[PDB]
Amino acid sequence: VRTIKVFTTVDNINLHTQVVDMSMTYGQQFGPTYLDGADVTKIKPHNSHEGKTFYVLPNDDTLRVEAFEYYHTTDPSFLGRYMSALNHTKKWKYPQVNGLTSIKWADNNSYLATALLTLQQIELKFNPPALQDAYYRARAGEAANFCALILAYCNKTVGELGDVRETMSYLFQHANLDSCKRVLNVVCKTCGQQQTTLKGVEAVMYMGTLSYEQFKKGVQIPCTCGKQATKYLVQQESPFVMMSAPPAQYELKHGTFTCASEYTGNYQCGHYKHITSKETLYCIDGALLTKSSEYKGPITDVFYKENSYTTTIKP
Ligand SMILES: [Cl-]
Ligand SMILES: [Cl-]
Ligand code: NA
Ligand code: NA
Ligand SMILES: [Zn+2]
């Protein structure tokens, strides 16, 4: 009976010594098994594998705790989805564009490129150690593990189309936004005033207009009475806000926003680009970069800096 020593893991930190039989596949011994993203379930141990670390699924009590502490999930297939994505994302390219880690276009990944570029321009800390560790690497330029985690957390495979707003929502749900607060007032002439307080992810996201200034002045929304009510921002305590709307031609004015996402085409058959407002307006499209003093395009998400805002509307 021939054996080698290998290590299994769910977090690539805590290792578990295994003595594996070289006459059996990894799958027969560990269940689904991966070597830096490559699926070795159906393969028998090679000599060169001695001492190497393999990912497995969290299919024992110790691994379940380690996986939950590191990723903050107990989705049974999470690790397989993360490894499957990593096998691809480790071959993607991550060029530095205007001082930020971008992603060379591949596998319909423009939504991930613009999400990744956005994260590097807003104040956000992640909760799962897996995202903390991988995001730090991504800022340094090695974003393969971060991108594979985004895919896994969002239940998207490599190649699958994704929506930036939805992706950001998932990332924000795995971020510490408990210091974020939003107070809204909704005023109908018939029905009166209704104040609502939003916290965390709902405090920094709004769907219906791209303009933070208009949100402060008031936006018209349906009232149940059939008239239009006015919704406006009473109070904001967030380091950023994200304003989203169905893509429409929209002018981005230098110095009035942090960054934005543009979507050209019809739904599920278009492409994202990223616009960042620095010394001028830079348009980052994966590896590609252009500049302009003005910008108009089909914008769908805009990010703004914030600290503390209180309205002056005396209603
Ligand atoms: Cl972080
Ligand atoms: Cl979390
Ligand atoms: Na950031
Ligand atoms: Na949170
Ligand atoms: Zn009403």
> Are 34 and 131 contained in the same domain?
no
Task: Judge if 271 and 202 occupy the same domain.
Answer: yes
Cα of 192 from ligand 5 centre, angstroms: 7
Ligand nearest to the CA of 230: 5
Q: Are residues 169 and 253 in the same domain?
A: no
Say if residue 307 is in the same domain as residue 199.
yes
Q: Which of 56, 74, 100 is the last residue of a domain?
A: 56
What residue type is assigned to position 247 of the chain? P
In this structure, are 145 and 194 located in the same domain?
Answer: no
User: How much distance in Å is there from the Cα of 178 to the middle of ligand 4?
Assistant: 6
**Whether residue 273 sits in one domain with residue 243:** yes
In a shared domain, residues 167 and 210: no
Q: Which residue has the tokens 């914030």?
A: 306
152 and 114 inside one domain: yes
**Cα–Cα separations (whole angstroms), residue 258 to 56, 94, 131, 241, 300:** 41, 22, 23, 10, 14
Residue 282 Cα to ligand 4 midpoint, Å, equals: 31
**3-state SS class at 17:** strand
Cα separation, 218 vs 213, in Å, equals: 9
Domain termination residue (choose one: 127, 157, 180): 180
Max distance between CA atoms of the chain, in angstroms, equals 83
Distance 214 CA to ligand 5 centre (A): 21
Q: Are 204 and 182 in contact (CB under 8 A)?
A: yes
My answer on whether 303 and 187 are in the same domain is yes
- Cβ atoms < 10 Å from Cβ of 4: 17
Helix residue ranges, H only, 43-182: 61-71, 78-89, 110-119, 129-140, 144-153, 164-173
User: Do both 167 and 201 map to the same domain?
Assistant: no
Residue where a domain terminates, one of 116, 148, 180: 180
173 and 186 in a single domain? The answer is no
CB atoms within 10 A of CB 76: 11
Gap from CA of 193 to ligand 5 centroid (Å): 9
Quick one: which ligand is closest to 72's CA?
2
> Which one, of 165, 78, 117, 139, lies nearest residue 288 by Cα?
117
Give me the helix-helix angle, 129-140 and 61-71, nearest 10°: 50
**Contact call for residues 132 and 125 (beta carbons, < 8 A):** yes
Q: Answer left, alpha or beta for residue 166, where phi above 0 means left and psi between -120 and 50 means alpha.
A: alpha
Do 38 and 119 belong to one domain? Answer: no
Nearest bound ligand to the CA of residue 172: 4
**Ligand found nearest the CA of 132:** 1
Q: What spacing in Å lies between the alpha carbon of 89 and ligand 2's midpoint?
A: 22
CA angle 109-113-118, nearest 5°? 150
CA 173 to centroid of ligand 4, rounded, Å: 5
Q: How far is the CA of 150 from the centre of ligand 1 (A)?
A: 13
How many helices (H) and strands (E) would you count in the chain? 9, 19
Number of domains in the chain: 3
Pick the ligand that lies closest to the CA of residue 128.
2
Q: What are phi and psi of 5, to 5 degrees?
A: -90, 130
Cβ neighbors of 90 (< 8 A, separation 6 or more) are: 36, 37, 144, 148
Q: Give the pair of three-digit tokens for residue 211.
A: 């303009």
Query: Which residues span the domain enclosing 47?
Result: 2-56
Rounded to whole angstroms, how far apart are CA atoms 269 and 161? 9
Compute the distance from residue 175 Cα to the ligand 1 centre, in Å.
8
Q: Would you state the structure tokens that stand for residue 194, as one six-digit string?
A: 């209704």
